[PDB]
Symmetry: C2
Subunit: 576 residues, 2 copies
Amino acid sequence: ASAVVHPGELDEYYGFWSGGHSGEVRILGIPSMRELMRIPVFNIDSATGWGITNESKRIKGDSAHLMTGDSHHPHMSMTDGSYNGKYVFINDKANSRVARIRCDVMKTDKMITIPNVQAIHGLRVQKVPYTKYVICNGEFEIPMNNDGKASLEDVSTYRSLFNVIDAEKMEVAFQVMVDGNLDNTDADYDGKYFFSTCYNSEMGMNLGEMITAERDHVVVFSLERCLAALKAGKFTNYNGNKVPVLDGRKGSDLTRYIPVPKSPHGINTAPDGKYFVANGKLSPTVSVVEIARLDDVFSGKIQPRDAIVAEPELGLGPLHTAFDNKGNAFTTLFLDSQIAKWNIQDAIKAYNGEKVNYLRQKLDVHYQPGHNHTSQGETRDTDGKWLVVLCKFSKDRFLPVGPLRPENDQLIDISGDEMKLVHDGPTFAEPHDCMIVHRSKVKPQKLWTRDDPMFADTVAMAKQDGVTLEMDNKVIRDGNKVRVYMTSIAPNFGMNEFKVKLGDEVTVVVTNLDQVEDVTHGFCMTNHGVQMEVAPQATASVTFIANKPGVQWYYCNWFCHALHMEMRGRMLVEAL
Amino acid sequence: SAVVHPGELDEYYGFWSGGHSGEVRILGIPSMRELMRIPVFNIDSATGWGITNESKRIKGDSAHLMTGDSHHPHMSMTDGSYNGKYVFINDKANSRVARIRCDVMKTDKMITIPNVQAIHGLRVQKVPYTKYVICNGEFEIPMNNDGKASLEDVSTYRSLFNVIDAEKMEVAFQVMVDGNLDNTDADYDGKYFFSTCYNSEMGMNLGEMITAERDHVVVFSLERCLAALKAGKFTNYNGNKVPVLDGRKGSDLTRYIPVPKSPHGINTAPDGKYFVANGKLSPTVSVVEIARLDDVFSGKIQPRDAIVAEPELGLGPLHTAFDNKGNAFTTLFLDSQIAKWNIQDAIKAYNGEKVNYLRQKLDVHYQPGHNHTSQGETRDTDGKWLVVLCKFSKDRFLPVGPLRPENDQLIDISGDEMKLVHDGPTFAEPHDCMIVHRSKVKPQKLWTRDDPMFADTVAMAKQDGVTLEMDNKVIRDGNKVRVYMTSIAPNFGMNEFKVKLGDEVTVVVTNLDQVEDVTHGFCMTNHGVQMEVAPQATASVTFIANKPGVQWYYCNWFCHALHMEMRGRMLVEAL
Ligand SMILES: [Ca+2]
Ligand SMILES: [Ca+2]
């Protein structure tokens, strides 16, 4: 289509982007490819104070002390295989966390550390009947009792686990121990199966060992059999936690292993729910599995390789596949630096021995593509309009900026069934993955509400102090703790000064009482490394030590009003 | 045209304030795409800036701060033209100034400015080159801010103007003033600097800060300040050695020009002939003829005689940029417009001639703060592009919840009518930006082993007998362990190493690839530790091995087809 969005025109879709090594999630407008917002997740965000405010530290829980992460796969909750706009889930590979973003407020509301695992890589959502579960893979291999004693160097004890999270509760429902490691994951359109690639079926501890096998596998998980095993008590608990771990190693009836060449990476469900495609990586192929054959693999009527219905050669380094609404597939070729457009039914005919061309087109991309994604492509609403390709090396595509270069997110018009590159988008910190949802499916709110759970503990603290946040400007003294409750209505804080003793632990609680959307305030204590966003009708709080004597100005750092520079007051720190 | 198609390059670099995010951003102009984020005052998960030992060294006395608010990014000049060497940037929130090296596009120096609170305006000396960087303390505090008798005694409170030696990155001197300070600029002669003041009242609340019908612009004579310093006419405060000069009203070092009303921006015209101070609460700007300043200093004329026009423009004038034709573009925050006006016509109208100085008002969306033209703060001003930094985007973009982006609007000014061409959503309210032609900036492609940015790490390795270009070694030092490893994609030079529970582990990684932008990373899983390791760079991080058992480290950057396999084990032995 046209990719130009002129002033006063709106984008058609939201993109929820991996922030990659930055630890954030980004909202893009499609097709303009402009970044509309950054949602802080695993990072310490100076702009909003996410990671330093008390409300955000509470959400981070057991990981509040961590300052970094690597945001991998962002995916939105579905009802009957269509996006429902409620949540976006995102994993941190670096510290094995999963977080949930509420789309009403576009902030992270839950975060959990997955036990018993190291490195959560693939993450997707259950599609059908709705996102009951979020699925994600432990990529690295570690002992279940990883205590630094006899298991430390004993590779025969090392395991990777597949993780099934209750999406609404944001708690791990169960884990499945597998043979090999795990890489990417996806779900069917029936609510019956989940499936993951494995690159280290060898359980190798160095690169050479991890690339010896001509075929690793896709492991398929039967949800029905897993739930039955759980109900029958056929699980183990490890590490003093209560997460049930099921045994899905070879020999189990919970899982089946389909051999796939070679150290495969992406695994992608076709939007008709008929097939999934596993991407060959070191083999110049993709492997196509017919989902309707999985029951026969589980019953032992056919062998796991009998579920493969095509295995077309495409090119060098296939990593990831996306789909249009017409039966075609778009596969990234990392080493050839192309997208291969191919037709699934023709690839099936060719696997059956028919002399038929399945390859439609190869498009040069710039350069070294990882994942690629189509508009609404992971749902039944796939529309065949846009393809976005996440290229890892931008080389000559942008002005030079030094020894660290941006990545290149390339937008391709696939609407004419003939692919045309229309935009090179420089991006920071190597987004891994993204998703594209039509604007009609996402409806954020304009104002916070006073009962929001995200600052409910801070409200409860105020109530214990006898403070009404909507009304009060009060200083509560609790020994060497000081709790300062202030209102803000642009261009004024509700207190012009307050006094504390040197060394006091000061918690400032600010409530923005403006009632107009977009009138964001901030609170910054100068020279203390403290700043935070205070959104309309929100309460936010930060705790710091008053370890600097004398006059210490606080101010509203956000431009909320013509007189915002004058929206400041003094913390007066008395000497001992 | 503002379209940059695939395989075409932008014409200019923009160096953008990251606002409350604490970073600096590099944009392509006119595409308005963000090419890079340079970490400064923030803790950058992508690169490890703020957690690596190299970056904490650079941060010095502020390595413990996790936040900042990056204000005014400006590039060094030679004879009033950008020279591409440095970009300087202030942190208002914690009173710091940092320097970015443009060869590697990383921050190389950072200092906390003493005796002050809240650095707002920052600009560079233009002529004969950027010898000095100039910046303002916005808030008013005692010089002996000890929490004793001065605490509530407002008569002790002061703001200081700060002159930094750009090449040394040390404060050269400070000038104490009456009133506070807001924005600043420099002439094109190397004679004068000048700052706005909104709190000439020394008010401690909003009402008190807006009582005066005129506050002022304070003009600093560089020659007189240098002479006073050499004569020993300075004081030191707070046990530091920064010389503070007395520029209060009546000093020979400064002159105070009355300007209505709580003014904000102050902007030098590209011919060096005028500066414009922006009226804010007064619907005017005040135009000063720079050549009159010597006569203000000698007493031949009085300070208000420096003003040659004070045209009414509209409600809330905040900031002025210039084309290459004698026109000015002033943001009107309250009217939500840009006013295009002609300086010489405004002077004629001030002198009673029946001439219209207002060329056009363009609606912007919405509530503009600063605005900037392409090469506009230099002699190379080309009159092609104007960017306007609007604070409220309202309905301009798809809705994203209670926090909305700002709107950076690109306007084609190359013809007689201003034409809006692009709305750019931006994060965290950029305060200010600059636009430099691509030909003036020439970054390098690879680091070199002698770079000062990791020299202390190299010197540590040398004390251990380690040659970083060759060695994969573990050094044991009591409860400290130093691990030196090479990386050549797709392999680290070690597949595993052993430590004891509770050891303080420093991992030093040197990337030996010789191809541009084959970036590696090092991440210690579940430890909150990750960093960029650029080609030919060394990077290091220190953490406690407080988790027993197998702890995988991996290359988080996609450096090779086999990057997922580029990983090894830290084996943490139980006690
Ligand atoms: Ca393998
Ligand atoms: Ca005033």
